[PDB]
């Protein structure tokens with residue numbers, strides 16, 4: 360609970376300290392990168408993570424819509440080009456889907472997206488729509504915290520995904536530099552740390568939803584049906 | 598998947614059929630009303646449900662803000678008076694909190710609210726903000742689907758809560774009558790069923806979050822800390 364404004368370097372350290380709560384520490388993530396995850400768990404992960412990825416560009420556009428500074432927009436738009444392509448990351452993820460046995464329609468349809476994942480992700484969007492652009496922009500800085508096994512995974516799609524993700528052009532540090540410039544009072548600094556925590560909560564909550572469904576055999580409505588019964592529509596956009 | 602517009606009576610039956618997915622069928626809810634719930638589970642439930650309750654009036658006001666029909670507003674505002682009082686339901690829930698051993702500050706602070714609960718609830722609000730008023734209004738119709746044991750529970754607060762909830766004046770059927778009037782095409786009807794499913798998903802997801810935290814010993818960041826580390830702020834409103 361910051362009492363006296365921290366310096367920019369010290370603030371950066373505090374922000375980086377929040378990485379301790381990054382989602383790589385979630386048992387579900389651990390199990391996937393341990394090879395202890397089942398195939399159900401893997402396909403679930405890709406389908407659900409895809410929703411996040413298709414939301415990012417909407418989230419970034421929301422930020423731009425709220426940002427009257429042309430130079431900031433000139434940088435921010437590169438995030439949208441990265442995701443949308445013109446291949447792009449959405450496309451790269453479609454290839455990973457294929458590699459793990461899911462069709463493009465399976466993914467594009469968003470039919471497999473668990474409501475807990477949806478709500479967590481949409482929270483990110485709705486923050487970006489409503490928050491001052493600086494705050495929303497800064498929340499992107501968690502990207503700084505970043506099979507075989509699984510023989511059944513198609514090498515070619517994989518490498519394809521891994522590879523497309525590697526040509527992104529956005530300035531991943533932008534959020535950080537902004538936060539250090541913008542958060543120049545104790546009050547802003549504490550609030551920024553809480554915004555970071557919000558973002559970390561989104562990522563952890565996505566994984567909790569996946570844990571319940573694919574690892575604990577407790578998907579939505581499991582006591583009442585064996586079919587997927589959850590809503591599958593971005594109701595206010597579609 | 599409605600192909601030919603249903604009649605109003607048949608549509609009502611379809612809507613009521615969605616009650617099969619109501620949250621009373623969630624293992625967490627079952628355990629509470631079975632007396633199989635632990636005290637941790639109960640206090641968690643009250644603290645987390647409280648967030649829903651404090652959001653309802655915001656949700657209802659959002660609907661009104663989107664509703665240029667004065668007569669509709671004249672009815673809808675009664676929902677806000679019910680919750681806000683002037684005692685009201687928010688107050689009634691504060692008394693139940695007391696009955697189960699939680700202080701007013703504990704509840705009002707929203708500090709115990711799990712992020713999964715928060716995201717699910719905020720989804721409701723953000724739907725209400727953005728959707729046409731008719732759609733948002735109709736989603737309220739799930740209210741139509743509606744300790745000892747637990748000796749440690751204070752009878753007086755309880756009865757107090759149970760009792761205040763019983764003097765609400767809103768027209769719980771309003772959403773239904775609107776849906777029957779408004780949803781006069783196959784397309785609107787299918788969409789309304791999907792909106793209902795959305796609402797049901799919110800309620801189930803709230804309970805999943807509670808299940809993970811209080812029943813499966815898997816609250817957020819459990820692999821990294823034993824303290825509550827999640828964000829506790831309505832960032833865009835506070």
Ligand SMILES: O=C(O)[C@@H]1Cc2c(O)c(O)c3c(c2N1)[C@H](C(=O)O)C[C@H](C(=O)O)N3
Nearest residue numbers: 415418448498499500501502503504505562
């Ligand atoms: O908020 C944002 O705009 C960024 C955009 C983004 C990505 O493109 C990821 O692939 C991506 C993240 C983000 N966040 C995630 C993030 O930290 O938010 C990390 C996650 C991962 O692979 O672990 N991948």
Ligand SMILES: O=C(O)[C@@H]1Cc2c(O)c(O)c3c(c2N1)[C@H](C(=O)O)C[C@H](C(=O)O)N3
Nearest residue numbers: 653656686736737738739740741742743800
């Ligand atoms: O969407 C809405 O406006 C209504 C308002 C409301 C309440 O006041 C509840 O107590 C309340 C609900 C709702 N929904 C819940 C709902 O069905 O949405 C049910 C739940 C229960 O006690 O089981 N309690």
